[PDB]
């Protein structure tokens, strides 16, 4: 999450097979969710906060 | 069986379709 590898938020690819999503809270690389654009830690944190609307603790 | 990508069951396992297992 180097503030230099927010060359992803730099919209330009060169080839649209380089656009690699990223988290958009820490800017992690490795556990984004298309549905949130968040890393699997950041997302979790926000879920616990209650700041991703409708995201409950799961149970069935 | 299972593993063999030139049977029916193998095909099923591998996920795909072709000569041995058609769409129809």
């Amino acid at each position: 999450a180097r503030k230099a590898l927010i060359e992803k938020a730099k919209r330009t690819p060169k080839f649209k097979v380089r656009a690699y999503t990223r988290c958009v809270r820490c800017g992690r690389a490795r556990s984004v969710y298309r549905f949130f654009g968040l890393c699997r830690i950041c997302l979790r944190e926000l879920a616990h906060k209650g700041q991703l609307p409708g995201v409950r603790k799961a149970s069935w | 069986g299972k593993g063999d990508r030139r049977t029916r069951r193998g095909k099923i396992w591998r996920g795909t379709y072709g000569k041995y297992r058609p769409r129809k």
Binding site: R25, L38, G50, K57 | -
Partner: protein, 206 residues
């Protein structure tokens, strides 16, 4: 090592979300980001006003920003000036109709994040950490809490070995869903390191 977040456990029931807006697969992502930005910005600004619930709705893309605070005066300005500036900033950031419906938290010692923030502030001034914690707890108890807890971990007042000073009052029933506990947390941004200020206030059941 255990112990999950109390709010993020009681979030289909006792306490509703700190954001409320539907959006599809196409737009939850952008909107979420926007909301996060808003929250960040407000935090940066209203640290003086003492901020708690930073509620938001997209009610047909009319952003509703609700900041439950400690000082309406400070948010507002000296009659109604700084409230406007903040709103404008939000608009600039987040280009949609944006409100800023300020509510004070009457009983500022029922809002647990506020309490936590206060404690953090005190710590930053380098006080007797344990003493401060105890005082905070007592204050909470006085307010009308049916139980309180403050966990403060870290380099206590500038210590070389990690500790976790720890104090409580009455009932802090951290397992029952029916409990309804305001959990607050404040990051004590201090001079020798970083101190964790976790605060739990048990206000009341059902």
């Amino acid at each position: 090592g255990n112990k999950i977040h109390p709010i993020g456990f009681r979030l289909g029931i006792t306490r509703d979300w700190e954001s409320r807006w539907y959006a599809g697969k196409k737009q939850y992502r952008h909107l979420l980001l926007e909301d996060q930005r808003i929250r960040g910005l407000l935090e940066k600004e209203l640290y003086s006003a003492g901020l708690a619930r930073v509620d938001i709705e997209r009610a047909a893309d009319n952003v509703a920003v609700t900041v439950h605070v400690a000082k309406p005066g400070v948010v507002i300005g000296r009659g109604g000036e700084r409230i406007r500036v903040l709103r404008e900033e939000l608009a600039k950031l987040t280009g949609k109709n944006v409100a800023l419906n300020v509510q004070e938290v009457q009983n500022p010692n029922l809002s647990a994040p506020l309490v936590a923030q206060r404690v953090a502030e005190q710590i930053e001034r380098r006080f007797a950490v344990r003493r401060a914690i105890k005082q905070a707890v007592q204050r909470v108890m006085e307010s009308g809490a049916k139980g309180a807890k403050v966990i403060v971990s870290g380099r206590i007042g500038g210590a070389e070995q990690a500790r976790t000073e720890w104090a409580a009052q009455g009932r802090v029933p951290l397992h029952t869903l029916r409990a309804n506990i305001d959990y607050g947390f404040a990051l004590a941004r201090t001079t020798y390191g970083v101190l964790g200020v976790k605060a739990y206030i048990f206000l009341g059941e059902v």
